Design a protein around this ligand. Sequence first.
Ligand SMILES: O=C1NC[C@H]2CCN(C(=O)OCc3ccccc3)CC[C@H]12
Length: 284
Amino acid sequence: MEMEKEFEQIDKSGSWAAIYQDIRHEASDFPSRVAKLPKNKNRNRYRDVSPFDHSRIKLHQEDNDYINASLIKMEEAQRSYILTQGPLPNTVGHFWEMVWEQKSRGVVMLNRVMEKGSLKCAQYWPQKEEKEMIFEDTNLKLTLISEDIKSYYTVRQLELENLTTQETREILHFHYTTWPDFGVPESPASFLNFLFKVRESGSLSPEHGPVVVHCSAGIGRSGTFCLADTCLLLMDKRKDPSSVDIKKVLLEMRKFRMGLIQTADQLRFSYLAVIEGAKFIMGD
Ligand SMILES: O=C1NC[C@H]2CCN(C(=O)OCc3ccccc3)CC[C@H]12
């Protein structure tokens, strides 16, 4: 059923809360035993948001391999994402170790360091060229190379150096800075242009490791980003784009990380985003 007609039917009936609860009821439940070990308590921002054991990213070290991050592998779309929590003061070194070990080109950040007057993640990248950051626990150096500040987002070029081998790589930081404190954006136009700019960079392409995506918990905004990306890609691949079922794609993605899409308003925004994105590719 053409998802726009499905959209108008749920709007006119006001049944977004009912649709969302049905997804919550059908979603996969897999064990998260490593996340709940006592040694990992200070590695988790939220007690109720944990990676499944089968899809968790493992750090390459014998001491403690744990990070709150999941590999979302979308087989038909041929896209992979790592979804992770905003880094904590004691996990910033782990975060950059993961970027290095997974060969990621891009980091997508969908939150502000401070929102609603509280800290939603650590200040994990350098703010000035001449003040680099050293992570002694993982033996990495991070330098700001350049910064481009636009009205709805900021792009930064970073250099990550493995101090063990003296290899260096360029990482692109894509920072969406205007997600409102309450609810979701009124129009999806600035969000869709942000995805297109991430795509344009090469960060989502198969010649690199998976893109690293985060918000505060790594399920809400983060879920919206990868759901919209994957749905639009399937519409360009499938003989009949009308066959793309956003609820079925969300359930597939929830096999790899719990809780993706946190509210019925986030669900409606994802639809809205996918509906408006299809008109620029297929319509005019
Ligand atoms: O701001 C803009 N004006 C022209 C547009 C050209 C590329 N854009 C696009 O394809 O539209 C939505 C979308 C984004 C990703 C995938 C499918 C559809 C992003 C917005 C751009």
